[PDB]
């Protein structure tokens, strides 16, 4: 019956994540930090897909990389949900718009929420939504929006942050201002260290890059892709990172073993809000502004997604669950390195379900 | 020819001193001393020894019979990487033979000095004289002299040489070291790629690490591998045979970029060497002392015999480090110095130990 679909969804999420990666890369400036959540965006879009028809249905399916009649997905996606994030995602809608019952049941069954309703005046809503996002993200994301349209009929939202932490704590006392290769200068940045941190790692020839997985709480890992030499730039690594490439990177990593290892990386501290309409368009999906068929969601025939915000917050500092083993006094028994000293690309990958929860990159902490 | 033979003899002598020094000193103490400069001072005295004292010194110093070349060889060995002072003083009532003073001048390029008249004038004389010719590194060689002093042997020495490769001072934090069974925090130097020749010796159960210094000197470090082995038991397992092999090995062993931590080495050790000579079973310097060659005077004894080593190895090097050591190029090789350890400061050219010692607590 289902089960099938954890695998199939898994694949589709990888493919989608890259699509977003590049589209995000594009909308952002050229040497910028970014972070976004393929999972939570895909789930929000998959919520919308539930009540899409004819064209909008086939077009979403296309974007999200789902095959035809992938009905199981809505269960599967709820099943995937990690407790290592706090992921909020409501469809709002104006009073003049009337939401179908058969949708609201299916939304409740499967997404355990349902479209909310906007107040009467435009200006009342902005405070509503920012309060509502703040409340259900425990104030991590307070201000999701700075404006709404005036004629707003259908708003999609998605705030998300990483609550998970490192399995293994980093000693804060062992965190100096060490060097990082920004642009062609060198800059000095807070950098975390452990003489023996547990690390699964290897080299990939195709990317010409160092791949480093680091364990986190809730069966999440952080996968880091740094180019090996400084002679390779990040941009050209991005453009060489196929979905086929990527999937092999993870199959490899699953076999690859965590071993005590000399570790430096920076404090990761990335927050990225993004008008996703721009992105959807960048992916060649224009339905959210014209020819939008959400029959399933509503009967109303003159329908368009007035706004679609995404926001990721992501801190990985020293704090871990478990304090480090054998005090890392020396580096006895281990003879391995992984240092992160130039701009790099990262997943935050679910190990259990084999898909990317977050994705991004760091040029400058 | 005698460079080889002297080389061997100096190794053997150095250990003999090591243990004797180990013995006179307390149990978990830093020490540092110079086998070369002590041996040379004793070899100066050997020049004018006769019958018994001659054969007994020869024995101690590990020289074979009729090793006449030695005095040249030893002068030839002298490194510019140290500042080594070593005078035989003597009182006015004692008369030094001419044939000695010429041979001393020829070979040791100095000659016995003479003491003032009153005991108390001499102490200031000698400490000034040692200060002057050691550029104030060793000021106060002595705190007392005997009263009836007739023959004083002295030897101050310090290491002027430095690391080939500088250590970054910015990269020197208060990191941990395993003193006693506690842990203490001590200034520790680091380089992600320092050039280091190293290996493991099973006999000692120890890490051996050579590090290059200026003037064809190296610093050889012997740390026990695990914390489970103590230093004391490593000392007692360190034969001359063991040691000589350690160096033959090291000569073949290659310097390679390597992850390095060690402490700041900062050791100064003054020592009444009579105590040592006795500890080595050489009693001539207080009775049955035959220095016919040095003097005709028949009622002769070495009233005092001081040694003093100063030894700083901090970050300062000749050459600043290559490729900035930004990351760790080629392989991860390691040598970390985090528990008490034993060291040579070894002449590579001539193959003998200039200094020897150990560090329990920086
Ligand atoms: O964990 S570590 O040794 O780096 O961290 C500090 C440490 O510096 C402090 O120890 C000493 O305490 C005196 C106060 O008398 C300070 O002058 C110095 O900071 C330090 O020499 C301890 C003491 O609370 O605090 C931290 O753990
Ligand atoms: C509610 O939704 C599920 C399918 O989404 C279905 O099993 C059930 O029949 C629905 N019930 C009602 C009252 O709509
Ligand atoms: C000086 O010393 C050398 C070697 O000991 C010797 O050849 C020479 O005869 C000595 N001369 C005198 C006058 O003492
Ligand atoms: O590298 C040494 C320098 O580091 C930092 O830039 C400090 O601001 C400066 O005062 C110091 O001398």
HEC assignment per residue over chain A: CCCHHHHHHHHHHHHHHHHHHHHHHHHCCCCCCEEECHHHHHHHHHHHHHCCCHHHHHHHHHHCCCCCCCCCHHHHHHHHCCCCEEEECCEEECCCCCECHHHHHHHHHHHCCCCCCCCCCHHHHHHHHHHHHHHHCCCCCCCCCCCCCCCCCEEEEEEEEECCCEEECCCHHHCCEEEECCCCCCEEEEEEEEEEEEEEEEEECCCCEEEEEEEECCCEEEEEEEECCCCCCHHHHHCCCCHHHHHHHHHHHHHCCCEEEEEEEECEEEEEEEEHHHHHHHCCCCCCCCCCCCCCCECCCCCCCCEEEEEEEEEECCCEEECCHHHHCCCCCCCCEEECCCCEEEEEEECCCCEEEEEEEECCC
Dist. CA A365 → ligand 4 center (Å):
19
Dist. CA B262 → ligand 4 center (Å):
24
Rounded Cα–Cα distance for residues A49 and A56 (Å) = 8
As beta bridge partners, residue A93 has: A154
A-chain CB neighbours of B327 within 8 Å are 337, 339, 341
Residue B262 has which token pair? 């060690």
Helix (H) or strand (E) holding B39, with range, is helix B35-47
Map tokens 């010796």 to a residue. Answer: B201
Dist. CA A102 → ligand 2 center (Å):
7
Q: Under a CB-based contact definition with an 8 Å cutoff, are residues B46 and B55 in contact?
A: no
Rounded Cα–Cα distance for residues B187 and B278 (Å) = 37
Residue A85 has which token pair? 């994030």
Dihedral sign computed on CA atoms, order A288, A291, A294, A298: positive
Rounded Cα–Cα distance for residues B275 and A252 (Å) = 68
Give the nearest ligand 2 atom to A101 CA.
Answer: 14
Q: Cα torsion for A179, A181, A184, A187, to the nearest 10°?
A: -40
* CB-ligand 1 contact for A173 (6 Å cutoff): yes
B-chain CB neighbours of A341 within 8 Å are 326-327
Q: What resolution in Å is listed for this PDB structure?
A: 2.9
Exposure string over A20-29, b if 16+ CB within 10 A, otherwise e? bbebbbeeee
Q: Under a CB-based contact definition with an 8 Å cutoff, are residues B357 and B33 in contact?
A: yes
- Is any Cβ of chain A less than 8 angstroms from the Cβ of B181? no
Q: Residue count of chain A, please give it.
A: 365
Ligand 1 mutation pick, A173, A175, A193, A327, max ligand atoms within 8 A of CB:
A173
Contacts for A205 with CB less than 8 Å, ≥ 6 apart: none
* CB-ligand 1 contact for A176 (6 Å cutoff): no
Q: Which of A28, A168, A342 is nearest to B326 (CA)?
A: A342
Contacts for A332 with CB less than 8 Å, ≥ 6 apart: B226
Q: List, chain by chain if needed, residues with CB within 6 Å of any ligand 3 atom.
A: B 99, 102-103, 106
Domain that holds residue A61: 1-365
Strand A154-162 versus strand A91-93 pairing type: antiparallel
Inter-axis angle of helices A38-50 and A54-63, to 10 degrees?
A: 160
- Is any Cβ of chain B less than 8 angstroms from the Cβ of A187? no
Helix, strand or coil, per DSSP, at residue B262: strand
B-chain CB neighbours of A335 within 8 Å are 331-334
Map tokens 């130990």 to a residue. Answer: B353
Residue B226 has which token pair? 């695990």
A-chain CB neighbours of B326 within 8 Å are 179, 341
- Is any Cβ of chain A less than 8 angstroms from the Cβ of B260? no
Name the DSSP class of B298: S
Number of domains in chain A: 1
Nearest-CB residue to A329 (from B176, B327, B331): B176
Rounded Cα–Cα distance for residues A310 and A41 (Å) = 7
Q: Under a CB-based contact definition with an 8 Å cutoff, are residues A313 and A187 in contact?
A: no
């Amino acid at each position: 019956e289902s089960h099938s679909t954890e695998a199939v969804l898994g694949d589709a999420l990888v493919d989608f994540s890259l699509k977003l990666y590049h589209a995000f890369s594009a909308m952002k400036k050229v040497e910028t930090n970014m972070a976004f959540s393929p999972f939570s965006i895909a789930s929000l879009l998959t919520q919308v897909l539930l009540g899409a028809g004819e064209n909008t249905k086939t077009n979403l399916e296309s974007i999200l990389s789902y095959p035809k009649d992938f009905t199981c997905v809505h269960q599967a996606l709820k099943g995937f949900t990690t407790k290592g994030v706090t992921s909020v995602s409501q469809i709002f809608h104006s009073p003049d718009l009337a939401i179908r019952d058969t949708f609201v049941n299916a939304s409740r069954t499967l997404y355990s929420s349902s479209p909310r309703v906007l107040s009467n005046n435009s200006d009342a809503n902005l405070e509503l939504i920012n309060t509502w996002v703040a409340k259900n993200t425990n104030n991590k994301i307070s201000r999701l929006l700075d404006s709404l349209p005036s004629d707003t009929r259908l708003v999609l939202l998605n705030a998300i942050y990483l609550s998970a932490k490192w399995k293994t704590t980093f000693d804060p006392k062992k965190t100096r201002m060490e060097p990082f290769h920004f642009k062609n200068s060198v800059i000095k940045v807070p950098m975390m260290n452990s003489k023996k941190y547990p690390v699964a790692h290897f080299i990939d020839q195709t990317l010409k890059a160092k791949v480093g997985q680091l364990q986190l709480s809730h069966n999440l890992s952080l996968v880091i892709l740094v180019p090996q030499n400084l002679k390779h730039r990040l941009e050209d690594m991005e453009q060489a990172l196929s979905p086929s490439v990527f999937k092999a990177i993870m199959e490899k990593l699953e076999m690859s073993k965590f071993q005590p290892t000399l570790l430096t990386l920076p404090r990761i501290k990335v927050t990225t809000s993004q008008d996703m309409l721009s992105i959807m368009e960048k992916l060649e999906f224009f339905d959210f502004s014209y020819d939008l068929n959400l029959c399933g969601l509503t009967e109303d025939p003159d329908l368009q997604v007035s706004a679609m915000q995404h926001q990721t917050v992501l801190e990985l500092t020293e704090t871990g669950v478990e304090a480090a083993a054998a005090s890392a006094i020396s580096v006895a028994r281990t003879l391995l390195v992984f240092e992160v000293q130039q701009p790099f690309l990262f997943m935050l990958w679910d190990q259990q379900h084999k898909f990317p929860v977050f994705m991004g990159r760091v040029y400058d902490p």
